[PDB]
Subunit: 156 residues, 3 copies
């Protein structure tokens, strides 16, 4: 006959979400070429047009320098594979500097200020092959079986 | 006339970044001294700052604030257990122990107290105020 | 009689013009010393005043470190020699971070992300003897008998 009150907390992050409102820069004059990319994964630049002024990007592969991370957008993205993706032949929202949430494949929390190493598919890994100049921003969390890590980005 | 500058005060209005979600874990922090991140909580998002020690990587420089911190001394100080402003990118005046101005664009080195001994770079400002010998430092975020 | 209509396109850029509205930084507390500076060419620092605060700049020279690139302005520039120049003893708008259109004297288009090399006179050249931290941004065009190149400047 006694009443019961309960309490629940929200999750703090989603893949490809901008971590906070610090100094950031979005490179939005790019176009997806040769396939599709995942929100929360790194991309590489294929070529930059001399006159038209659009860069050509795709998912990261072996032996390629990353350029940025795709970020969430409720308008520019299409829903496929139960998640947000960017389809081929369309404008993309690439983040080049700032704090972002990234998909992870590691199993242990990282160290603040250490260098970020990626996997061959553009996802963070504690023992990846591709080396970057980015550093960890401190965040490390999970959303319903999806691991997320907070990454600091600076311009190339 | 007027004094030229004070420790912990931002030099110019160029690109700057200030992290206000921090707290002094232990001891007191002097305004205008470098700080380091002892522990960054993964979920809570707060950074525990401390005065620079031997063989550690600096993070930023504590700045002044007339409301966040008050003190009975002439010089401002951050008390233990209080929110702290730390600037991570931009030009700031800093405490120094050197006596001659170094070359412009040189890479500066930090003492064990958080001071400036004989990566951040020199910006070109070298003044004197009440025997403090401020130095102007450019901080980048890596 | 058959009616006719015509078409013509404008140019893309001008020497010394700011490329786009990405994150940039202009250092306006500078003074020109010992000579004239061409808009769209790199500059060097000869003395930074310790108390007054102004910086003394001049055209680039052999065995020196460049600081930035002067930009266009319709109020701070004098019209001499059928073009815009910065005269001696006047304030100059010097850019130290961002994308800019810069004078060039090479013959082949550059590759994205590679390092920039300068000539003795302060103009971009593919085999110059001066090393810079700057990179190429992909723009490469030509005004009337003038070559231009898009350059990304990082803060020194």
């Amino acid at each position: 006959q006694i009443n019961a009150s309960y309490q629940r907390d929200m999750a703090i992050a989603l893949p490809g979400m901008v971590a906070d409102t610090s100094k950031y820069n979005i490179d939005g004059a790019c176009v997806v070429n040769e396939g599709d990319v995942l929100v929360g994964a790194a991309v590489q630049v294929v070529q930059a047009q001399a006159v038209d002024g659009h860069k050509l990007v795709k998912a990261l592969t072996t032996g390629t320098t990353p350029y940025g991370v795709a970020i969430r957008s409720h308008w520019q993205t299409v829903n496929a594979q139960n998640q947000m993706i960017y389809e081929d032949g369309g404008a993309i929202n690439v983040m080049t500097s700032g704090r972002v949430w990234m998909l992870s494949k590691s199993t242990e929390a990282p160290t603040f200020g250490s260098a970020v190493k990626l996997d061959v598919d553009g996802q963070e890994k504690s023992d990846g092959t591709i080396e970057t100049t980015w550093t960890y921003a401190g965040g490390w969390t999970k959303y319903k079986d999806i691991q997320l890590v907070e990454v600091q980005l600076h311009q190339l």
